[PDB]
Amino acid sequence: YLEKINEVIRRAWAVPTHGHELGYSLCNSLRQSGGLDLLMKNCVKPDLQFSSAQLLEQCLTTENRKHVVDNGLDKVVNVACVCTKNSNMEHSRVGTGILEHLFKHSEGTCSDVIRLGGLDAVLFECRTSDLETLRHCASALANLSLYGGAENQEEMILRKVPMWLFPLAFHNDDNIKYYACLAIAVLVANKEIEAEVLKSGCLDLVEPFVTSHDPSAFARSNLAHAHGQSKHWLKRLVPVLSSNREEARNLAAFHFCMEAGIKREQGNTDIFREINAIEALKNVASCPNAIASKFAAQALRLI
Numbered sequence: 001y002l003e004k005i006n007e008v009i010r011r012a013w014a015v016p017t018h019g020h021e022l023g024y025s026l027c028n029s030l031r032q033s034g035g036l037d038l039l040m041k042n043c044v045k046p047d048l049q050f051s052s053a054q055l056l057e058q059c060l061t062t063e064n065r066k067h068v069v070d071n072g073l074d075k076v077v078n079v080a081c082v083c084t085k086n087s088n089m090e091h092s093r094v095g096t097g098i099l100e101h102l103f104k105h106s107e108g109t110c111s112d113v114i115r116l117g118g119l120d121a122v123l124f125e126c127r128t129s130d131l132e133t134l135r136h137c138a139s140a141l142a143n144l145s146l147y148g149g150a151e152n153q154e155e156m157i158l159r160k161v162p163m164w165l166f167p168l169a170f171h172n173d174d175n176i177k178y179y180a181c182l183a184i185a186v187l188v189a190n191k192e193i194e195a196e197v198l199k200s201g202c203l204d205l206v207e208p209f210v211t212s213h214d215p216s217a218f219a220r221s222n223l224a225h226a227h228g229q230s231k232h233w234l235k236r237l238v239p240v241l242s243s244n245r246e247e248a249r250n251l252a253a254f255h256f257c258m259e260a261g262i263k264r265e266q267g268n269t270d271i272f273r274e275i276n277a278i279e280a281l282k283n284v285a286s287c288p289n290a291i292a293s294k295f296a297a298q299a300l301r302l303i
């Protein structure tokens with residue numbers, strides 16, 4: 001009864017504050033009951049492919065990503081690429097969503113997804129005008145930047161990912177712009193990419209953005225990120241709090257300020273201690289940079 005399960009999970013994620021726990025508990029139930037394995041078996045049957053992919057896309061949570069990686073990554077990447085090739089916009093959104101989440105597991109899994117065509121599929125879809133698809137693409141590239149590690153940055157350089165990112169950063173949609181800028185803020189730690197970023201001028205988009213958006217309202221602006229990111233994702237963003245580039249530090253501080261507000265309402269403020277962001281934030285709350293300092297201080301107060 002996929003149509004009914006997909007509706008339940010969609011409604012669960014959408015509950016403000018509680019949707020994080022509700023979606024996680026349902027998606028974990030799917031794994032423990034054997035339903036996740038059934039979806040992976042069915043996603044290679046042409047008749048059951050899109051319905052299976054539609055539910056997979058909504059349940060690629062932390063532990064389920066591990067399960068897919070261990071049991072059938074090649075099948076899931078294939079279905080996602082099939083979906084991006086389909087003409088229906090509903091399909092394109094699903095395929096790009098799957099790939100966005102498969103880039104949030106590990107360096108090695110990013111390498112496998114790239115090997116199987118996942119990055120090529122995302123870059124191809126960057127040509128679309130569909131906002132939801134483009135939002136998935138920008139998020140996928142931010143995730144790949146955060147999780148790919150050094151090996152995969154060389155592969156991003158060869159495929160000219162920075163080039164695909166800069167147009168997304170100048171997009172007028174705030175969610176596309178934000179996640180494109182987050183990817184860029186992460187990648188400037190790579191000195192070869194840094195040169196291209198400085199020439200682009202995209203980093204100049206940060207100061208107008210963070211001073212014009214209230215972190216709390218921005219969180220509520222898109223259902224997909226209303227509950228924030230996982231501690232494993234935030235752990236990987238912590239180093240940007242001490243980036244070489246002032247603009248990147250500013251964006252990371254804004255992000256942590258937003259996450260602090262969200263995690264306060266969930267009772268998960270302890271994750272910041274676990275990922276050693278408290279000390280990284282305390283340092284920024286004392287530095288001369290007034291923009292980043294204010295955001296980090298508000299984050300600590302929210303924590």
Ligand SMILES: O=C(NCc1ccc[n+]([C@@H]2O[C@H](COP(=O)(O)O)[C@@H](O)[C@H]2O)c1)Nc1ccc([N+](=O)[O-])cc1
Pocket residue numbers: 013019020023056057058059060061062101104223224225227228229230231232268271
């Ligand atoms: O609330 C969340 N996500 C919320 C959300 C919303 C709508 C859909 N989905 C689906 O879930 C899978 C991605 O999972 P995520 O990478 O976790 O987003 C994908 O299939 C996605 O379509 C998730 N995450 C979270 C938060 C706090 C902590 N924490 O406090 O440690 C840990 C994790």
Ligand code: NA
Pocket residue numbers: 016017219220226227
């Ligand atoms: Na919310």
Ligand code: NA
Pocket residue numbers: 171172173174175177
């Ligand atoms: Na914008």
